[PDB]
Symmetry: C4
Subunit: 199 residues, 4 copies
DNA sequence: AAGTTGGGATTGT
DNA sequence: GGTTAGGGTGAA
DNA sequence: AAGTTGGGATTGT
DNA sequence: GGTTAGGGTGAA
DNA sequence: AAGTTGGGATTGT
DNA sequence: GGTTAGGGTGAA
DNA sequence: AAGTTGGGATTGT
DNA sequence: GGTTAGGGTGAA
């Protein structure tokens, strides 16, 4: 529900920051590699956040980049992996270092991670690979999370994304968009013709 | 609890917008037909919202118009239908297009919707019809949600609404208000004489 | 957790108001007798609130006066009575009218209330009486909620209140404070000597 | 999630304060010894908070000092002890008085506490001792909560803290940091070499 | 060294 | 809360 | 009119 | 979700 | 005085 | 919600 | 083509 | 979590 926080860094107790937005100071759990980039205390920060709601607790996970947030969101989906593991994962190695490891099948590095033996280690590199690359090694090539989250147009990605939010199966979503063939239209325009055609 | 959000559109990833209110950026899930009307990023937006609270998650559903929110709230009440379906429903066709379909029994269109076969399709048009019309085809004739939500006075509608919030049965609420016969009094005044008479 | 809301009245749909605080518009459920006192839309309002948190939902109940909030909080404690009943209760009759009815055992009036037959009706007047009066008929004589919530000093009341928040039994709390005999000290000072003596 | 509140003290009803931050007034439950230090009403206050989320309720616990918050957080961990007991505990005696009692095994004082007989009394002094002292009697010697929460460097403490947040066992965390031997580096730098070495 | 018996633990239900 | 992994210890 | 058999419903668990 | 009241309807 | 039988209650599940 | 403490009352 | 056997899935509990 | 729909695939 909370997607981003923008306020003054009041305090730093890794892995958590205390950012004041208005008069309310929120606690944000951030991966060490991200934390290293937080501006000095007293400075204003902007951090994308993944909000977690439990029956007994509700925490905030933050990242400096949307891509970073996305990778983390995909990581948590992975079986056996939750907020804590992903956090540890992104403290030992950076979003890049991870991409790299999964596309270079550097299991070793992943295993030595606290709480992550061969089993999940492999799971990661497996469930994660496919998604990557479109990235072509760089985690910041354009529309990186569309890539992760959904190489064809940026707007087509976005549209396939949305169609899948609406219930269409991914095959369906893709085929549905391309049938339209218009990489140079607004992602909303595609989402719109596509729909109009589906029904 | 949250009934409206007013802030700067920070980002757009259909179907969700990221609106910053103060320093907090809220994620809002909006039907594609609504989304199409959102001002450019950077602009200020005002979106009525339906807040959903689960044990494991709490999301925000937004609409450009109160009527739009109301229709959605009625849709979710419908059996087999929840936030996601209604969202899809209002992405394939607009509040109007829906009204139209239910009052013209255009099942076809509804069936082709992702996740909505004949069964719920019919349920919709059935449970929804009665409520409509007072609307007389237009979704924006005056006090449209009173119509949906509760053709006699605007204040009588509102009052019957409230009386039903308090526990009176709808028959009761209606008869109770009209007994007062004063379409030209404040909805609060009716709610007030009515009560005074009931007790 | 939320104890008060202060913002601009954006809209009125009895029994709920939509007050904007900053950029966030909160929905507040208020008893009709209270609602009648809300300033015009567009004006700024201040409303004490009772926050309700469920597994499937979290609403806000508001009152113009702390006393009004207190009475409602005591009402909800009453067995068989919850937010909705109390709301109805305070829509049919005012905090005064209620006090009056309980201290004049006007069951009749209470029974005719929607959802409140003889059974709870009596329960009310029973569980509520004792608490009242110190009030001496007026709901706004000084420190009315201390009265309800905890005729001796205002500070002694407050202190007995706190001691009971800490685990002391009410008998204990009272006797403990008076032993101190100092109606003219700060409620905090009493809470402080009292404690110091208990341990 | 909420780690601090900064606003205007709107009202005082010990043990709870009503602080307005922006337009929202939050209720904060504070131990009497802390409460005694709150500035006059109308003044601005800053209070560290421990946010509690239940299925049926979500309250805010506040303290004037981070150390005070930390002690309370450790207290709640203690078996048989929860927010209420700790609150009572810190109403009868101050963070100091407590430290003192645990390091001087003043069971007596603890027993007389409402709800705290010999059983938990001992538990406290037992589970709490070890943690203390590094404190050397004073609760405000530098990095007191690192002490409580994690006498070697401030940055090493912090780093061991973080490593333990990530899943490393405390033995592991400690040994891991010292192996680095660099009390004069940033806690982040340690967390960083340490990790780099672990993997 | 390689498999096993267990306590601990977020994860998933 | 039960269950699956984690990764520790003991066995062969 | 007085008690009873039931569907509906917030309340309480 | 089960359970207690509410207050409707039918019985006597 | 010392142990026991119970109602009450946050705590822990 | 069940369970463990709390601390009250009654027993010996 | 029409009914059936199943995996998937929000919905409802 | 169990359950009802959804809508896929296979059968006749």
């Amino acid at each position: 529900m909370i997607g981003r926080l923008r306020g003054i860094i009041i305090e730093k107790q890794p892995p958590l920051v205390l950012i004041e937005v208005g008069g309310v100071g929120y606690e944000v759990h951030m991966p060490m590699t991200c934390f290293y980039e937080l501006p000095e205390a007293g400075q204003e920060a902007i951090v994308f956040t993944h909000f977690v709601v439990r029956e007994d607790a509700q925490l905030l996970y933050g990242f400096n980049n949307k891509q970073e947030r996305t990778l983390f969101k995909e990581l948590i989906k992975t079986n056996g992996v939750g907020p804590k593991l992903a956090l540890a994962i992104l403290s030992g190695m950076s979003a890049q270092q991870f991409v790299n490891a999964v596309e270079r099948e550097e299991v070793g590095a992943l295993v030595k991670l606290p709480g992550i033996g061969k089993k999940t280690a492999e799971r990661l590199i497996v469930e994660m690979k496919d998604r990557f690359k479109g990235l072509h090694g760089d985690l910041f090539t354009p529309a990186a999370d569309l890539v992760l989250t959904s190489a064809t147009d940026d707007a087509e990605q976005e549209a396939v994304a949305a169609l899948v939010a609406l219930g269409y199966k991914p095959q369906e979503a893709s085929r549905m968009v391309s049938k339209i063939a218009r990489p140079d239209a607004s992602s909303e325009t595609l989402i719109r013709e596509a729909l109009r055609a589906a029904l």
